[PDB]
């Protein structure tokens, strides 16, 4: 693992220092249907004309990015995503910009959000949850080794591919940082207490978020929920967690160590780092190399009808993609 990460860093740093730019243009694609929206972007299924391949095109309105104070975040998002390379990270295939918008064209992950399956099924079995959790553990090990913090782990940002494995999308809050950072960002249910309390924080927040994810996958609801974010934050900071009756003793132990307010006690953040998690009893059956090599049989594989099938995604209201004859925010996004 230590040789692997060393080589992986060399590869990442070359691309980090000299990023890819302007590798496609809008008229090379036919836009088909919206796959998802979020606070910032719209992601559309598109067909690349010259190849016939389908992709997922994230479209960011430059003026909205500026309004929502996401300039640096969006530049981070693209710079990091074009530089990373890992089996459970979605691949950025092209990126480009026009007068009005920024575009990031990713591999289309057709199995849908984990979110939709989780809500429909209700909850995942512990082996099912563990399979996904192991992929996230390996991905964070990779990202943290590159000095990256991810900061938006949630089922809505996790896609299921044709083999039933996870693809992490949405690097909107990802940041390369060696020290502390202070930005209040993420999604309410998944925020670590130290973010809420306006403290400097570090990559330990991703391990907290993993605790929340595992809990939600196995329970079918988050460990801290309420009608409004303010009410959720009060629950998070108190830190009191109650577990479903069906949770194994091993799972409860793991979660007590991940959903730990005390940073000196939180798994992932101690002397042994990620190995405290990898060697925990809950993961005793996990073959970590087999997961990385994608040789483990997935517990669930979504139904796939054919190329361009969007059956695993909700329907969204469509909007015209507008491109002004005047360049917007040219200097701000020069490096994009």
């Amino acid at each position: 693992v230590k040789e692997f990460l060393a080589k992986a860093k060399e590869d990442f740093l070359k691309k980090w220092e000299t990023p890819s730019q302007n590798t496609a243009q809008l008229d090379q694609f036919d836009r088909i249907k919206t796959l998802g929206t979020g606070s910032f972007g719209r992601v559309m299924l598109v067909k690349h004309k010259e190849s016939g391949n389908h992709y997922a095109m994230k479209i960011l309105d430059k003026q909205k990015v500026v309004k929502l104070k996401q300039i640096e975040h969006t530049l981070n998002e693209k710079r990091i995503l074009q530089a990373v390379n890992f089996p459970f990270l979605v691949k950025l295939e092209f990126s480009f910009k026009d007068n009005s918008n920024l575009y990031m064209v990713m591999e289309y992950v057709a199995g849908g959000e984990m979110f939709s399956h989780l809500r429909r099924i209700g909850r995942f079995s512990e082996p099912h949850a563990r399979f996904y959790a192991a992929q996230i553990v390996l991905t964070f090990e990779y990202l943290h080794s590159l000095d990256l913090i991810y900061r938006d782990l949630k089922p809505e940002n996790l896609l299921i591919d044709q083999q039933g494995y996870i693809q992490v999308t949405d690097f909107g809050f990802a940041k390369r940082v060696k020290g502390r950072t202070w930005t209040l960002c993420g999604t309410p249910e998944y925020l670590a207490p130290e973010i809420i309390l306006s403290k400097g924080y570090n990559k330990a927040v991703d391990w907290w978020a993993l605790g929340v994810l595992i809990y939600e996958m196995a329970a079918g609801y988050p460990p801290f929920f309420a009608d409004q974010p303010i009410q959720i934050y009060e629950k998070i900071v108190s830190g009191k967690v109650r577990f479903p009756s069906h949770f194994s003793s091993d799972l409860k132990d793991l979660l007590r160590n991940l959903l730990q307010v005390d940073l000196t006690k939180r798994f992932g953040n101690l002397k042994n780092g990620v190995n405290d998690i990898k060697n925990h009893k809950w993961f005793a059956t996990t073959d970590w190399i087999a997961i990385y090599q994608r040789k483990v049989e997935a517990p669930f594989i979504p139904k796939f009808k054919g190329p361009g099938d969007t059956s695993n995604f909700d329907d969204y209201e469509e909007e015209e993609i507008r491109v002004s004859i005047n360049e917007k925010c040219g200097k701000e996004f020069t490096e994009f």
């Binding site: 960002c185 329970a219 079918g220």
Partner: peptide, 19 residues
């Protein structure tokens, strides 16, 4: 039950990032 309370709550749909 906690499940019933969650399903009757206002945050069972997709959650977007804070902004």
């Amino acid at each position: 039950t906690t499940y019933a309370d969650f399903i009757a709550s206002g945050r069972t749909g997709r959650r977007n990032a804070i902004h």
